[PDB]
Amino acid sequence: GSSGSSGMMLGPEGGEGYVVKLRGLPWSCSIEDVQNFLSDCTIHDGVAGVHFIYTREGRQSGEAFVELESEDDVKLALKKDRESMGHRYIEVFKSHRTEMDWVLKHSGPNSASGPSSG
């Protein structure tokens, strides 16, 4: 059985990690709501594992990524799909880390075309 991306540099950068994207979150959604929402999941670094998505203006688009500890967590998170958080509905989306990185760098109200280098 060949599963789990141990690690590789050559070819397609293999630096992804168990992550999930939550949509439909309330404009007042806080790391806490997420942590409890994905209880069945073991978020990595807890609060230090949740990444909310913002617009170029500085608002809460609703999207919010969340890092996990292991694979199982991912499969479990996907179970919280079309869920109900507080007074709204939440939608889980299977995503990797390498992605949550770009989606963020180019999400907040302050991007400035990423870093100087280019």
Side-chain angles (χ1 to χ4, degrees), residues 15-17 19 21 53 63 65 93-106:
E16 62 170 39
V19 176
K21 162 192 274 189
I53 304 290
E63 284 157 326
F65 291 66
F93 289 123
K94 211 286 198 79
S95 209
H96 44 113
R97 186 273 207 160
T98 306
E99 159 158 347
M100 177 195 62
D101 270 329
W102 95 248
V103 309
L104 288 167
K105 303 158 90 163
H106 318 334

mmCIF file with all atom_site columns, all heavy atoms in Angstrom, residues 15-17 19 21 53 63 65 93-106:
data_model
loop_
_atom_site.group_PDB
_atom_site.id
_atom_site.type_symbol
_atom_site.label_atom_id
_atom_site.label_alt_id
_atom_site.label_comp_id
_atom_site.label_asym_id
_atom_site.label_entity_id
_atom_site.label_seq_id
_atom_site.pdbx_PDB_ins_code
_atom_site.Cartn_x
_atom_site.Cartn_y
_atom_site.Cartn_z
_atom_site.occupancy
_atom_site.B_iso_or_equiv
_atom_site.pdbx_formal_charge
_atom_site.auth_seq_id
_atom_site.auth_comp_id
_atom_site.auth_asym_id
_atom_site.auth_atom_id
_atom_site.pdbx_PDB_model_num
ATOM 1   N N   . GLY A 1 15  ? 4.585   19.361 -0.761 1.00 0.00 ? 15  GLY A N   1
ATOM 2   C CA  . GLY A 1 15  ? 4.551   19.947 0.566  1.00 0.00 ? 15  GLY A CA  1
ATOM 3   C C   . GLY A 1 15  ? 3.145   20.307 1.005  1.00 0.00 ? 15  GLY A C   1
ATOM 4   O O   . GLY A 1 15  ? 2.917   21.384 1.556  1.00 0.00 ? 15  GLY A O   1
ATOM 5   N N   . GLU A 1 16  ? 2.201   19.405 0.760  1.00 0.00 ? 16  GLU A N   1
ATOM 6   C CA  . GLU A 1 16  ? 0.810   19.635 1.133  1.00 0.00 ? 16  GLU A CA  1
ATOM 7   C C   . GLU A 1 16  ? 0.506   19.035 2.502  1.00 0.00 ? 16  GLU A C   1
ATOM 8   O O   . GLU A 1 16  ? 1.214   18.145 2.973  1.00 0.00 ? 16  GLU A O   1
ATOM 9   C CB  . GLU A 1 16  ? -0.128  19.035 0.082  1.00 0.00 ? 16  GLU A CB  1
ATOM 10  C CG  . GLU A 1 16  ? 0.012   17.530 -0.071 1.00 0.00 ? 16  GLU A CG  1
ATOM 11  C CD  . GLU A 1 16  ? -1.087  16.926 -0.923 1.00 0.00 ? 16  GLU A CD  1
ATOM 12  O OE1 . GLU A 1 16  ? -1.481  17.560 -1.923 1.00 0.00 ? 16  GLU A OE1 1
ATOM 13  O OE2 . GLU A 1 16  ? -1.554  15.817 -0.588 1.00 0.00 ? 16  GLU A OE2 1
ATOM 14  N N   . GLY A 1 17  ? -0.551  19.529 3.137  1.00 0.00 ? 17  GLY A N   1
ATOM 15  C CA  . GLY A 1 17  ? -0.930  19.031 4.447  1.00 0.00 ? 17  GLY A CA  1
ATOM 16  C C   . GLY A 1 17  ? -2.434  18.975 4.633  1.00 0.00 ? 17  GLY A C   1
ATOM 17  O O   . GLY A 1 17  ? -3.172  19.743 4.017  1.00 0.00 ? 17  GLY A O   1
ATOM 18  N N   . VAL A 1 19  ? -5.797  19.725 5.140  1.00 0.00 ? 19  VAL A N   1
ATOM 19  C CA  . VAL A 1 19  ? -6.483  20.999 5.317  1.00 0.00 ? 19  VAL A CA  1
ATOM 20  C C   . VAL A 1 19  ? -7.915  20.928 4.799  1.00 0.00 ? 19  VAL A C   1
ATOM 21  O O   . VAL A 1 19  ? -8.251  20.065 3.989  1.00 0.00 ? 19  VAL A O   1
ATOM 22  C CB  . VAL A 1 19  ? -5.742  22.140 4.595  1.00 0.00 ? 19  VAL A CB  1
ATOM 23  C CG1 . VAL A 1 19  ? -6.526  23.439 4.706  1.00 0.00 ? 19  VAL A CG1 1
ATOM 24  C CG2 . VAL A 1 19  ? -4.339  22.305 5.158  1.00 0.00 ? 19  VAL A CG2 1
ATOM 25  N N   . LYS A 1 21  ? -11.548 23.543 3.767  1.00 0.00 ? 21  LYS A N   1
ATOM 26  C CA  . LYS A 1 21  ? -12.097 24.871 3.525  1.00 0.00 ? 21  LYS A CA  1
ATOM 27  C C   . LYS A 1 21  ? -13.568 24.934 3.922  1.00 0.00 ? 21  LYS A C   1
ATOM 28  O O   . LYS A 1 21  ? -14.389 24.160 3.427  1.00 0.00 ? 21  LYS A O   1
ATOM 29  C CB  . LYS A 1 21  ? -11.939 25.250 2.050  1.00 0.00 ? 21  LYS A CB  1
ATOM 30  C CG  . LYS A 1 21  ? -12.839 26.395 1.617  1.00 0.00 ? 21  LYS A CG  1
ATOM 31  C CD  . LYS A 1 21  ? -12.866 26.541 0.105  1.00 0.00 ? 21  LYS A CD  1
ATOM 32  C CE  . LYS A 1 21  ? -11.714 27.401 -0.393 1.00 0.00 ? 21  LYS A CE  1
ATOM 33  N NZ  . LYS A 1 21  ? -11.852 27.730 -1.839 1.00 0.00 ? 21  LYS A NZ  1
ATOM 34  N N   . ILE A 1 53  ? -10.670 33.619 5.611  1.00 0.00 ? 53  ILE A N   1
ATOM 35  C CA  . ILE A 1 53  ? -10.495 34.287 4.327  1.00 0.00 ? 53  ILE A CA  1
ATOM 36  C C   . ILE A 1 53  ? -11.131 35.673 4.336  1.00 0.00 ? 53  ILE A C   1
ATOM 37  O O   . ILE A 1 53  ? -12.270 35.841 4.772  1.00 0.00 ? 53  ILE A O   1
ATOM 38  C CB  . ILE A 1 53  ? -11.102 33.463 3.176  1.00 0.00 ? 53  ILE A CB  1
ATOM 39  C CG1 . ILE A 1 53  ? -10.503 32.055 3.156  1.00 0.00 ? 53  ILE A CG1 1
ATOM 40  C CG2 . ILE A 1 53  ? -10.871 34.161 1.845  1.00 0.00 ? 53  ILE A CG2 1
ATOM 41  C CD1 . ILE A 1 53  ? -9.053  32.022 2.730  1.00 0.00 ? 53  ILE A CD1 1
ATOM 42  N N   . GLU A 1 63  ? -15.258 32.310 3.587  1.00 0.00 ? 63  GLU A N   1
ATOM 43  C CA  . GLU A 1 63  ? -14.369 31.159 3.481  1.00 0.00 ? 63  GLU A CA  1
ATOM 44  C C   . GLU A 1 63  ? -13.335 31.166 4.603  1.00 0.00 ? 63  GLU A C   1
ATOM 45  O O   . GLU A 1 63  ? -12.898 32.224 5.054  1.00 0.00 ? 63  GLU A O   1
ATOM 46  C CB  . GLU A 1 63  ? -13.664 31.155 2.123  1.00 0.00 ? 63  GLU A CB  1
ATOM 47  C CG  . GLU A 1 63  ? -14.552 30.696 0.978  1.00 0.00 ? 63  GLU A CG  1
ATOM 48  C CD  . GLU A 1 63  ? -14.081 31.212 -0.368 1.00 0.00 ? 63  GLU A CD  1
ATOM 49  O OE1 . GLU A 1 63  ? -13.548 32.340 -0.417 1.00 0.00 ? 63  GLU A OE1 1
ATOM 50  O OE2 . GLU A 1 63  ? -14.244 30.487 -1.372 1.00 0.00 ? 63  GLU A OE2 1
ATOM 51  N N   . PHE A 1 65  ? -10.021 28.403 5.912  1.00 0.00 ? 65  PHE A N   1
ATOM 52  C CA  . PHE A 1 65  ? -9.299  27.137 5.885  1.00 0.00 ? 65  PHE A CA  1
ATOM 53  C C   . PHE A 1 65  ? -8.949  26.680 7.299  1.00 0.00 ? 65  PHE A C   1
ATOM 54  O O   . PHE A 1 65  ? -8.902  27.484 8.229  1.00 0.00 ? 65  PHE A O   1
ATOM 55  C CB  . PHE A 1 65  ? -8.025  27.270 5.049  1.00 0.00 ? 65  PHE A CB  1
ATOM 56  C CG  . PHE A 1 65  ? -8.287  27.452 3.582  1.00 0.00 ? 65  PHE A CG  1
ATOM 57  C CD1 . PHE A 1 65  ? -8.916  28.594 3.114  1.00 0.00 ? 65  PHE A CD1 1
ATOM 58  C CD2 . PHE A 1 65  ? -7.903  26.482 2.670  1.00 0.00 ? 65  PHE A CD2 1
ATOM 59  C CE1 . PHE A 1 65  ? -9.159  28.765 1.764  1.00 0.00 ? 65  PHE A CE1 1
ATOM 60  C CE2 . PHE A 1 65  ? -8.143  26.647 1.318  1.00 0.00 ? 65  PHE A CE2 1
ATOM 61  C CZ  . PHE A 1 65  ? -8.771  27.790 0.865  1.00 0.00 ? 65  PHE A CZ  1
ATOM 62  N N   . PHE A 1 93  ? -15.046 21.776 2.449  1.00 0.00 ? 93  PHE A N   1
ATOM 63  C CA  . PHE A 1 93  ? -14.435 21.515 1.151  1.00 0.00 ? 93  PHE A CA  1
ATOM 64  C C   . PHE A 1 93  ? -13.031 20.941 1.316  1.00 0.00 ? 93  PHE A C   1
ATOM 65  O O   . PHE A 1 93  ? -12.174 21.540 1.967  1.00 0.00 ? 93  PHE A O   1
ATOM 66  C CB  . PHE A 1 93  ? -14.378 22.800 0.322  1.00 0.00 ? 93  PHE A CB  1
ATOM 67  C CG  . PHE A 1 93  ? -15.723 23.265 -0.156 1.00 0.00 ? 93  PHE A CG  1
ATOM 68  C CD1 . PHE A 1 93  ? -16.187 24.532 0.164  1.00 0.00 ? 93  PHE A CD1 1
ATOM 69  C CD2 . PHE A 1 93  ? -16.524 22.438 -0.925 1.00 0.00 ? 93  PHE A CD2 1
ATOM 70  C CE1 . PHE A 1 93  ? -17.425 24.962 -0.273 1.00 0.00 ? 93  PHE A CE1 1
ATOM 71  C CE2 . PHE A 1 93  ? -17.763 22.862 -1.367 1.00 0.00 ? 93  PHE A CE2 1
ATOM 72  C CZ  . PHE A 1 93  ? -18.213 24.127 -1.041 1.00 0.00 ? 93  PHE A CZ  1
ATOM 73  N N   . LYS A 1 94  ? -12.801 19.774 0.723  1.00 0.00 ? 94  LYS A N   1
ATOM 74  C CA  . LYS A 1 94  ? -11.503 19.116 0.802  1.00 0.00 ? 94  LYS A CA  1
ATOM 75  C C   . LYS A 1 94  ? -10.441 19.918 0.055  1.00 0.00 ? 94  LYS A C   1
ATOM 76  O O   . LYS A 1 94  ? -10.524 20.095 -1.160 1.00 0.00 ? 94  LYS A O   1
ATOM 77  C CB  . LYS A 1 94  ? -11.588 17.702 0.226  1.00 0.00 ? 94  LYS A CB  1
ATOM 78  C CG  . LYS A 1 94  ? -10.627 16.721 0.876  1.00 0.00 ? 94  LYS A CG  1
ATOM 79  C CD  . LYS A 1 94  ? -9.197  16.960 0.423  1.00 0.00 ? 94  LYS A CD  1
ATOM 80  C CE  . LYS A 1 94  ? -8.313  15.755 0.708  1.00 0.00 ? 94  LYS A CE  1
ATOM 81  N NZ  . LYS A 1 94  ? -8.504  14.676 -0.300 1.00 0.00 ? 94  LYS A NZ  1
ATOM 82  N N   . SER A 1 95  ? -9.443  20.398 0.789  1.00 0.00 ? 95  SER A N   1
ATOM 83  C CA  . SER A 1 95  ? -8.365  21.181 0.196  1.00 0.00 ? 95  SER A CA  1
ATOM 84  C C   . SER A 1 95  ? -7.030  20.860 0.860  1.00 0.00 ? 95  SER A C   1
ATOM 85  O O   . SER A 1 95  ? -6.988  20.293 1.954  1.00 0.00 ? 95  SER A O   1
ATOM 86  C CB  . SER A 1 95  ? -8.664  22.676 0.324  1.00 0.00 ? 95  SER A CB  1
ATOM 87  O OG  . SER A 1 95  ? -8.077  23.406 -0.741 1.00 0.00 ? 95  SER A OG  1
ATOM 88  N N   . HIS A 1 96  ? -5.941  21.226 0.193  1.00 0.00 ? 96  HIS A N   1
ATOM 89  C CA  . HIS A 1 96  ? -4.602  20.977 0.719  1.00 0.00 ? 96  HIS A CA  1
ATOM 90  C C   . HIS A 1 96  ? -4.027  22.238 1.358  1.00 0.00 ? 96  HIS A C   1
ATOM 91  O O   . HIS A 1 96  ? -4.710  23.257 1.468  1.00 0.00 ? 96  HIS A O   1
ATOM 92  C CB  . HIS A 1 96  ? -3.677  20.489 -0.397 1.00 0.00 ? 96  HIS A CB  1
ATOM 93  C CG  . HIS A 1 96  ? -3.821  21.257 -1.675 1.00 0.00 ? 96  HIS A CG  1
ATOM 94  N ND1 . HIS A 1 96  ? -2.831  22.072 -2.180 1.00 0.00 ? 96  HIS A ND1 1
ATOM 95  C CD2 . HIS A 1 96  ? -4.850  21.327 -2.553 1.00 0.00 ? 96  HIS A CD2 1
ATOM 96  C CE1 . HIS A 1 96  ? -3.244  22.613 -3.312 1.00 0.00 ? 96  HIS A CE1 1
ATOM 97  N NE2 . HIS A 1 96  ? -4.466  22.177 -3.561 1.00 0.00 ? 96  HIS A NE2 1
ATOM 98  N N   . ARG A 1 97  ? -2.769  22.161 1.778  1.00 0.00 ? 97  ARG A N   1
ATOM 99  C CA  . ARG A 1 97  ? -2.103  23.295 2.408  1.00 0.00 ? 97  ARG A CA  1
ATOM 100 C C   . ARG A 1 97  ? -1.515  24.233 1.358  1.00 0.00 ? 97  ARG A C   1
ATOM 101 O O   . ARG A 1 97  ? -1.826  25.424 1.329  1.00 0.00 ? 97  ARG A O   1
ATOM 102 C CB  . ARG A 1 97  ? -0.999  22.807 3.348  1.00 0.00 ? 97  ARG A CB  1
ATOM 103 C CG  . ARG A 1 97  ? -0.355  23.919 4.159  1.00 0.00 ? 97  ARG A CG  1
ATOM 104 C CD  . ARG A 1 97  ? 0.789   24.573 3.400  1.00 0.00 ? 97  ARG A CD  1
ATOM 105 N NE  . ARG A 1 97  ? 1.780   25.156 4.300  1.00 0.00 ? 97  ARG A NE  1
ATOM 106 C CZ  . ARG A 1 97  ? 3.027   25.437 3.937  1.00 0.00 ? 97  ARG A CZ  1
ATOM 107 N NH1 . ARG A 1 97  ? 3.432   25.189 2.699  1.00 0.00 ? 97  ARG A NH1 1
ATOM 108 N NH2 . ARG A 1 97  ? 3.871   25.968 4.813  1.00 0.00 ? 97  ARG A NH2 1
ATOM 109 N N   . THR A 1 98  ? -0.662  23.687 0.495  1.00 0.00 ? 98  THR A N   1
ATOM 110 C CA  . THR A 1 98  ? -0.029  24.474 -0.554 1.00 0.00 ? 98  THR A CA  1
ATOM 111 C C   . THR A 1 98  ? -1.010  25.472 -1.161 1.00 0.00 ? 98  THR A C   1
ATOM 112 O O   . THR A 1 98  ? -0.609  26.518 -1.668 1.00 0.00 ? 98  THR A O   1
ATOM 113 C CB  . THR A 1 98  ? 0.527   23.574 -1.674 1.00 0.00 ? 98  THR A CB  1
ATOM 114 O OG1 . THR A 1 98  ? 1.405   22.588 -1.120 1.00 0.00 ? 98  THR A OG1 1
ATOM 115 C CG2 . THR A 1 98  ? 1.274   24.398 -2.712 1.00 0.00 ? 98  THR A CG2 1
ATOM 116 N N   . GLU A 1 99  ? -2.296  25.141 -1.101 1.00 0.00 ? 99  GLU A N   1
ATOM 117 C CA  . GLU A 1 99  ? -3.333  26.011 -1.646 1.00 0.00 ? 99  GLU A CA  1
ATOM 118 C C   . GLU A 1 99  ? -3.716  27.094 -0.642 1.00 0.00 ? 99  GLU A C   1
ATOM 119 O O   . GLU A 1 99  ? -3.671  28.285 -0.951 1.00 0.00 ? 99  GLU A O   1
ATOM 120 C CB  . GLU A 1 99  ? -4.569  25.191 -2.024 1.00 0.00 ? 99  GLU A CB  1
ATOM 121 C CG  . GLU A 1 99  ? -5.841  26.016 -2.117 1.00 0.00 ? 99  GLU A CG  1
ATOM 122 C CD  . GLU A 1 99  ? -6.899  25.363 -2.985 1.00 0.00 ? 99  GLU A CD  1
ATOM 123 O OE1 . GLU A 1 99  ? -6.561  24.406 -3.712 1.00 0.00 ? 99  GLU A OE1 1
ATOM 124 O OE2 . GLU A 1 99  ? -8.064  25.810 -2.937 1.00 0.00 ? 99  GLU A OE2 1
ATOM 125 N N   . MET A 1 100 ? -4.093  26.672 0.560  1.00 0.00 ? 100 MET A N   1
ATOM 126 C CA  . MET A 1 100 ? -4.484  27.607 1.610  1.00 0.00 ? 100 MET A CA  1
ATOM 127 C C   . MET A 1 100 ? -3.445  28.713 1.766  1.00 0.00 ? 100 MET A C   1
ATOM 128 O O   . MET A 1 100 ? -3.740  29.783 2.301  1.00 0.00 ? 100 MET A O   1
ATOM 129 C CB  . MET A 1 100 ? -4.663  26.869 2.938  1.00 0.00 ? 100 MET A CB  1
ATOM 130 C CG  . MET A 1 100 ? -4.995  27.788 4.104  1.00 0.00 ? 100 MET A CG  1
ATOM 131 S SD  . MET A 1 100 ? -4.789  26.982 5.703  1.00 0.00 ? 100 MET A SD  1
ATOM 132 C CE  . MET A 1 100 ? -3.039  26.605 5.671  1.00 0.00 ? 100 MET A CE  1
ATOM 133 N N   . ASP A 1 101 ? -2.231  28.449 1.296  1.00 0.00 ? 101 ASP A N   1
ATOM 134 C CA  . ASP A 1 101 ? -1.149  29.424 1.384  1.00 0.00 ? 101 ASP A CA  1
ATOM 135 C C   . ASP A 1 101 ? -1.366  30.566 0.395  1.00 0.00 ? 101 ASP A C   1
ATOM 136 O O   . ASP A 1 101 ? -1.297  31.738 0.763  1.00 0.00 ? 101 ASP A O   1
ATOM 137 C CB  . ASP A 1 101 ? 0.197   28.748 1.116  1.00 0.00 ? 101 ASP A CB  1
ATOM 138 C CG  . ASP A 1 101 ? 0.841   28.220 2.382  1.00 0.00 ? 101 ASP A CG  1
ATOM 139 O OD1 . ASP A 1 101 ? 0.621   28.820 3.455  1.00 0.00 ? 101 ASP A OD1 1
ATOM 140 O OD2 . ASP A 1 101 ? 1.567   27.206 2.301  1.00 0.00 ? 101 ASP A OD2 1
ATOM 141 N N   . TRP A 1 102 ? -1.624  30.214 -0.859 1.00 0.00 ? 102 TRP A N   1
ATOM 142 C CA  . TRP A 1 102 ? -1.848  31.209 -1.901 1.00 0.00 ? 102 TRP A CA  1
ATOM 143 C C   . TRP A 1 102 ? -3.175  31.932 -1.687 1.00 0.00 ? 102 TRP A C   1
ATOM 144 O O   . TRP A 1 102 ? -3.236  33.161 -1.726 1.00 0.00 ? 102 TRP A O   1
ATOM 145 C CB  . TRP A 1 102 ? -1.832  30.548 -3.280 1.00 0.00 ? 102 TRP A CB  1
ATOM 146 C CG  . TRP A 1 102 ? -3.195  30.184 -3.781 1.00 0.00 ? 102 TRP A CG  1
ATOM 147 C CD1 . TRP A 1 102 ? -3.692  28.926 -3.968 1.00 0.00 ? 102 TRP A CD1 1
ATOM 148 C CD2 . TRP A 1 102 ? -4.238  31.088 -4.163 1.00 0.00 ? 102 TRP A CD2 1
ATOM 149 N NE1 . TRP A 1 102 ? -4.980  28.993 -4.442 1.00 0.00 ? 102 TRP A NE1 1
ATOM 150 C CE2 . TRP A 1 102 ? -5.338  30.309 -4.570 1.00 0.00 ? 102 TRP A CE2 1
ATOM 151 C CE3 . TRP A 1 102 ? -4.349  32.482 -4.198 1.00 0.00 ? 102 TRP A CE3 1
ATOM 152 C CZ2 . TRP A 1 102 ? -6.532  30.878 -5.006 1.00 0.00 ? 102 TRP A CZ2 1
ATOM 153 C CZ3 . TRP A 1 102 ? -5.534  33.044 -4.633 1.00 0.00 ? 102 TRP A CZ3 1
ATOM 154 C CH2 . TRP A 1 102 ? -6.613  32.243 -5.032 1.00 0.00 ? 102 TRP A CH2 1
ATOM 155 N N   . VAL A 1 103 ? -4.233  31.161 -1.461 1.00 0.00 ? 103 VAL A N   1
ATOM 156 C CA  . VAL A 1 103 ? -5.558  31.729 -1.239 1.00 0.00 ? 103 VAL A CA  1
ATOM 157 C C   . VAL A 1 103 ? -5.517  32.821 -0.177 1.00 0.00 ? 103 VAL A C   1
ATOM 158 O O   . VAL A 1 103 ? -6.297  33.773 -0.219 1.00 0.00 ? 103 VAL A O   1
ATOM 159 C CB  . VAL A 1 103 ? -6.567  30.647 -0.809 1.00 0.00 ? 103 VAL A CB  1
ATOM 160 C CG1 . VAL A 1 103 ? -6.532  29.471 -1.772 1.00 0.00 ? 103 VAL A CG1 1
ATOM 161 C CG2 . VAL A 1 103 ? -6.284  30.191 0.614  1.00 0.00 ? 103 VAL A CG2 1
ATOM 162 N N   . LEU A 1 104 ? -4.602  32.679 0.776  1.00 0.00 ? 104 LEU A N   1
ATOM 163 C CA  . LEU A 1 104 ? -4.458  33.654 1.851  1.00 0.00 ? 104 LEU A CA  1
ATOM 164 C C   . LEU A 1 104 ? -3.637  34.855 1.391  1.00 0.00 ? 104 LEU A C   1
ATOM 165 O O   . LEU A 1 104 ? -4.119  35.987 1.388  1.00 0.00 ? 104 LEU A O   1
ATOM 166 C CB  . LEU A 1 104 ? -3.798  33.007 3.069  1.00 0.00 ? 104 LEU A CB  1
ATOM 167 C CG  . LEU A 1 104 ? -4.661  32.022 3.856  1.00 0.00 ? 104 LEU A CG  1
ATOM 168 C CD1 . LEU A 1 104 ? -3.808  31.217 4.824  1.00 0.00 ? 104 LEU A CD1 1
ATOM 169 C CD2 . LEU A 1 104 ? -5.765  32.758 4.602  1.00 0.00 ? 104 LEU A CD2 1
ATOM 170 N N   . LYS A 1 105 ? -2.394  34.599 0.999  1.00 0.00 ? 105 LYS A N   1
ATOM 171 C CA  . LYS A 1 105 ? -1.504  35.656 0.533  1.00 0.00 ? 105 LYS A CA  1
ATOM 172 C C   . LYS A 1 105 ? -2.225  36.583 -0.440 1.00 0.00 ? 105 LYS A C   1
ATOM 173 O O   . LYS A 1 105 ? -1.898  37.765 -0.547 1.00 0.00 ? 105 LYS A O   1
ATOM 174 C CB  . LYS A 1 105 ? -0.270  35.053 -0.140 1.00 0.00 ? 105 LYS A CB  1
ATOM 175 C CG  . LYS A 1 105 ? 0.510   34.107 0.756  1.00 0.00 ? 105 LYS A CG  1
ATOM 176 C CD  . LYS A 1 105 ? 1.357   33.141 -0.057 1.00 0.00 ? 105 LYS A CD  1
ATOM 177 C CE  . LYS A 1 105 ? 2.743   33.706 -0.326 1.00 0.00 ? 105 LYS A CE  1
ATOM 178 N NZ  . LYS A 1 105 ? 3.701   32.648 -0.750 1.00 0.00 ? 105 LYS A NZ  1
ATOM 179 N N   . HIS A 1 106 ? -3.210  36.040 -1.150 1.00 0.00 ? 106 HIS A N   1
ATOM 180 C CA  . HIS A 1 106 ? -3.979  36.819 -2.113 1.00 0.00 ? 106 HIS A CA  1
ATOM 181 C C   . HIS A 1 106 ? -5.449  36.885 -1.709 1.00 0.00 ? 106 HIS A C   1
ATOM 182 O O   . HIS A 1 106 ? -6.339  36.675 -2.532 1.00 0.00 ? 106 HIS A O   1
ATOM 183 C CB  . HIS A 1 106 ? -3.850  36.213 -3.510 1.00 0.00 ? 106 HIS A CB  1
ATOM 184 C CG  . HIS A 1 106 ? -2.459  35.767 -3.843 1.00 0.00 ? 106 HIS A CG  1
ATOM 185 N ND1 . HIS A 1 106 ? -1.334  36.317 -3.265 1.00 0.00 ? 106 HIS A ND1 1
ATOM 186 C CD2 . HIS A 1 106 ? -2.015  34.816 -4.699 1.00 0.00 ? 106 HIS A CD2 1
ATOM 187 C CE1 . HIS A 1 106 ? -0.258  35.725 -3.753 1.00 0.00 ? 106 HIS A CE1 1
ATOM 188 N NE2 . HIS A 1 106 ? -0.643  34.810 -4.624 1.00 0.00 ? 106 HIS A NE2 1
#
